[PDB]
Amino acid sequence: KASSFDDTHKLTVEKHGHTALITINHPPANTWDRDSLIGLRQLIEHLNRDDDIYALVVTGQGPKFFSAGADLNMFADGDKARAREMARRFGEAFEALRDFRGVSIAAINGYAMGGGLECALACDIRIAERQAQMALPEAAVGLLPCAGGTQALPWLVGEGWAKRMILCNERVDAETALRIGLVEQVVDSGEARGAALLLAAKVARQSPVAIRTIKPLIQGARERAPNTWLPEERERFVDLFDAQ
Amino acid sequence: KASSFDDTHKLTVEKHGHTALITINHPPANTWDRDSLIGLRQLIEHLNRDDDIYALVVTGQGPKFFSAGADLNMFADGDKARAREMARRFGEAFEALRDFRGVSIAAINGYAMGGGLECALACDIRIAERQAQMALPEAAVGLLPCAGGTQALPWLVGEGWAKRMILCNERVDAETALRIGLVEQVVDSGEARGAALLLAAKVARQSPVAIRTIKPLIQGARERAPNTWLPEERERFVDLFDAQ
Amino acid sequence: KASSFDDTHKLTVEKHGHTALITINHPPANTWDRDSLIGLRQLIEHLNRDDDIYALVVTGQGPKFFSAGADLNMFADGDKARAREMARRFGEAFEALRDFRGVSIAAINGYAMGGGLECALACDIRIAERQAQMALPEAAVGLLPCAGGTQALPWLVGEGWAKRMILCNERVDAETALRIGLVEQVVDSGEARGAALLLAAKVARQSPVAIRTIKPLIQGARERAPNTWLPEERERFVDLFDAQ
Amino acid sequence: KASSFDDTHKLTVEKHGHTALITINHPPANTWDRDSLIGLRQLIEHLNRDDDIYALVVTGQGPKFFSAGADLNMFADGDKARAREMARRFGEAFEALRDFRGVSIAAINGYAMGGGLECALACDIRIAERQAQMALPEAAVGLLPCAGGTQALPWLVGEGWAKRMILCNERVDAETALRIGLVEQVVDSGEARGAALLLAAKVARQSPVAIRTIKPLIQGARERAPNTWLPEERERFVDLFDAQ
Amino acid sequence: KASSFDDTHKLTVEKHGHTALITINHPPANTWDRDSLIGLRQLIEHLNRDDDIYALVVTGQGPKFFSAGADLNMFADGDKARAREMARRFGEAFEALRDFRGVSIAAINGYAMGGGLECALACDIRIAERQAQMALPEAAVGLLPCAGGTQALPWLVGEGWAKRMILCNERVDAETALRIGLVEQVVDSGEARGAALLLAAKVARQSPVAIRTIKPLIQGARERAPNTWLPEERERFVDLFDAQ
Amino acid sequence: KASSFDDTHKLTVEKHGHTALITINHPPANTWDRDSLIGLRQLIEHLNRDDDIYALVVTGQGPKFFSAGADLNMFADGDKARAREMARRFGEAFEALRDFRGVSIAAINGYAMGGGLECALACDIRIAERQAQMALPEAAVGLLPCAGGTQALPWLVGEGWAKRMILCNERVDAETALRIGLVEQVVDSGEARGAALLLAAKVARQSPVAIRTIKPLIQGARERAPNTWLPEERERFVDLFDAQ
């Protein structure tokens, strides 16, 4: 899928059924840069226009790294202007992945730190390998998680654990992540990608138009309290009842 | 309790102390229909006007089903008009049960799927039997949980598990439900009703006027961020200090 | 730290590195009164103006009590006027502790009930000893948790467990608290203070200006939905990139 | 209307068609006290249960005063406890009048100052006599408009004029009030009551069930942004289409 | 503009510079029906993809009617299903016109009642002819303004005048509309279209990319309080500073 | 007042009673630059710590310009980094002036365009001279009002007139500004400063502690719907009743 456009070779896309497998391919640490952040946004835009795609899996190339976060080549020095543009690209890329019209599954096959973890927080579901370690260590260098980490992390794991990770710089492993809600499924070494593609196959058995309508409803509390969406819930239910 | 009005025989009510035991009695699957959804709303309205009632337990008649959700007799065919009215009745019935002035305890004695699960999400506390299985499989038929499921489920279990259940159609058992926050207590087969009635007895030992005032405060985040309620919290605290 | 001002001897402060150790010293139950609630607010105000302080630990003097909540000497009788002023002092003291510019760690060394538990909910992180028991039993005397308990408790543990504690008056121990998210770390008897001071030392290794900026961002959902803060997140990220 | 219950002789009620004419009768200044604030809330509760009442007019007895605000007999001295209870009674009385299920019309026949003005802000529509003068002069005695004035006044007239009245203690006459949106219609001396009863007669020509449903929708922005109500608008539109 | 697609002859579109002139052409009263509501949404979608279009004017064909609101052919009888679909089409058509990426100007050349008025409320700016009369008389037939009228009308004119129009069924003329904020400019008979096209020409002198970015910011209070957008304001300001 | 610190000679401060008269002194157009935006924030910080100051007037030196907005020396070229810092300084300076603890009065003595108008929108009350002209013409150069103009302007004048000014680049004079709510008082040439200082004297007759408490309440709708502040209103009313 994404068969043709200027897609960076740092992001490989393969079609497996109704599922798009995205692999971060940037050695040695599967780090995110400008080229890949631009390609990610564009790629999500085309997958939202591909009606053959009901699901999405992203994972890191190789067995060691899911993603080590932001390249150092970007928050270089130095340039104040670079930093701002880079924070922009992270938001645009990960908000787009967040707004994927199907379901997105993060197959955490290793270290997911900083921006790599924020990328997985951007996905709908996370599947981590037993040895995987995740953290947001930006405060250690006087910075912060600018790709949504300050909001997404406490959203799943709660404020206590979120500031244990960000404010105290403590990393967590897959089994601790499962205990606190950061991940939904722990699997053995080398089983995330596979596990993710198989969970992405269960989605292709559901009505795609129902998935696309339901998902924004589930994320409703991210912009507005849940009770404010209940009338909208019935309305989209009737919209789904129409057209069988 | 609810000693006299036109209450459908599909909903049996028995008074045990300061507790109203509601039993869904609609074989074979304790399914919800129009008659029972109307009776539920009306029943909650009278229990809110009965000052002898401090608590509430709902459970499914029989050992197999808590509730299998919406009757097929309602989202029949077909009629676009039926579907809309039915989504309305679900909201009105379960929002009323949600707005019960005392505490409500769901004693999940079996399958609670779709609308049956939304009914239990409407209650304050859930107690599940070990063998009980719960899901929201509406997306499998191109529909959605229209009785609050798209908001209530992620509210307790988080977005990851909520779309694991809704978007991926994966069901969960009582022990998984406990791990993710969907239920608060797991008990052995045939022990939910009993467990629920005994938890409903601890409530009758607390000031009822304090329960009625406190409960809306606890649900405050469902309509508005928690910090916006703090001045209101002290105000209702003084209201409780008045009248001893 | 807090080396000089009128600080009540009911609140002892000792400086350990970049960490301020606050100890509730009011026998026999480390109860909160007017004098201590005033001193707490004032103390947090000076710690926010002490740039030598990056973290904060509060704990109860002695091995038995963290804090038994509100003194009876305050919600005395009786005076309607007293009650209101007291609810005010709780809010002001614990909202200030909540708004501490560094990280605050509750070292629960025993019973933390009512206002004592609300004090620990006010802190960023909670570390409980195995034998510690926590509850909000205000509804048992016809009152309510007026120091933020009705909002803070469901915020961490969810609505089900929050009303299990408040509406049903059921207390929880440290291992149950860990299971539900009320605490982040369980430790053995006599190890909380120590554990807390060592977690407070990891914070002094991070940029303080990053901690002060990040923490309000993490608590953003308490006043406004998380998505509304994302542009602000990047903006404060660039503010942190400036000044290296 | 309100034909029988313990209604204080300080509040006279007369039935004119489908309209309830409420007259503040407390010389010399039509001031609000505890007895009248309690009676007002109770009176609105019964008018909401009287299906013969589609509209409501309140005005001051005599030609000189609509209402001079709060009695001095209440924020007496002195008692801290009195003040709090009194602020409570104002809110409860005027929020109830605000939540009247039909339309309420303030016929301002004279001075409406402080609580008298807040009473008229509580009504749906205001009709002022040419000589009428309105202000919120609470800040002049070190207090504030505690019956909703700090929110209702800028809601209609804008922040500039609202703090011109409250923060600068400047009063306005009926013609200035019309220019800024504080009133909707200016009439000649002795014509407000009459004008109000005739506007209240136009309401009795509309579907009452439509008025009761529509009015909360119009006030939707007072609790939540307008766009959040649009799905609810259609839903209540279909509810009105049902039952013809 | 909109040079080619299935556009209903009930909606005529002509290109005048960078401005699209939309004319409701449905005698005798320029009423809105299903065919025209579908065409309106589609038309706005294509104008948002036409980079040659910076502005938009809608007006009624003929000198007598701007729009008399909803056709009777739709809320026919009767069918409950029809009513719901029709409320849906109004929302979708007018929310799209509301979300036009350029500026939209309503040239009110006559009666604009009910849905016709809601259509003009959907536009950015309103220019009314002296003889034009506007109202929302839905409550007179037991219905309500389902195309946003219950939210848009008080948004501009305030609650008092909004329920004077809706709850009391009182219509307003162009000079009263100007006094209350319902319209921004009053012009003489036969001068609205012309006035609107000339105001739409001033827009083509501004940066289009600035108009598209600014307009959502101006409407920010419709979904969220204004202070929550200020960081976003600077961010889009820098986005505009980039690309010159 | 502001008797001693590094205050830029571009901002002259004179003490007249309990009022601080701030005069933008930067020829020829009273334009805002970095030096003056920094000094403004600092100046407001010290006036908030001066208990001798109850009010504030800002106006432009000379008879021709109130303020022509942002210096060209700042959004120079060119530097992307400059633009961002400058948008930051505007927000910080005008949000501080907005958050002045007393009342602030803009005495518009001439042109107030772009940032000059945003400065006056930041004040509580605006008094304009008859010849004064105001606009936000940023969209004409492909930019936007980054100092709050996109939120403050529609907040007072409504969306129609706000986008008439911003999206259509149409300027308004003092008499049009009065008609639409942009200003509260129009005065003759050379009378604004004087008028403002005399309105600032009426404020010094009110309780300062009441002004400081009330003003945030009036601006409550800028961050949260008005109904959410009503319990807080009574609470601060009792806080004002305490301490006489």
Numbering used by the authors:
A (entry chain B), B (entry chain B), C (entry chain B), D (entry chain B), E (entry chain B), F (entry chain B): 9 to 252
Task: Copy out sentences from the published article reporting this entry, exactly as the authors wrote them.
In P. aeruginosa, the gene PA0745 encodes a putative crotonase, named dspI, which has been shown to be responsible for the CDA biosynthesis. The structural studies confirmed the catalytic features of DspI as an enoyl-coenzyme A (CoA) hydratase that catalyzes the dehydration of 3-hydroxydecanoyl-CoA during CDA synthesis. DspI is a α/β protein composed of six perpendicular antiparallel β-strands surrounded by eleven α-helices. It can be divided into two domains: the N-terminal spiral domain (α1–α8 and β1–β6) and the C-terminal trimerization domain (α9-end).
The proteins were crystallized in two different space groups. The P31 form has six molecules and the P6322 form has only one molecule per asymmetric units. The atomic coordinates from the two space groups were refined at a resolution of 2.10 Å and 2.25 Å. In both crystal forms, the first eight residues have not been modeled because of the poor density in this region. The C-terminal segment (residue 252–272) is further missing in the P6322 form. Hexamer organizations could be generated by applying the symmetry operations in both crystal forms. The hexamer is a dimer of two stacked trimers and each subunit possesses the canonical crotonase fold. Although the crystal soaking and co-crystallization did not generate the substrate (or analogue) that bound the DspI structure, the 2Fo-Fc difference map around the active site in the P6322 form allowed us to model an acetic acid molecule in it. The hydroxyl group from the acetic acid points toward residue Glu126 and Glu146, implicating the possible binding pattern for the 3′ hydroxyl group of the CDA-CoA precursor 3-hydroxydecanoyl-CoA.
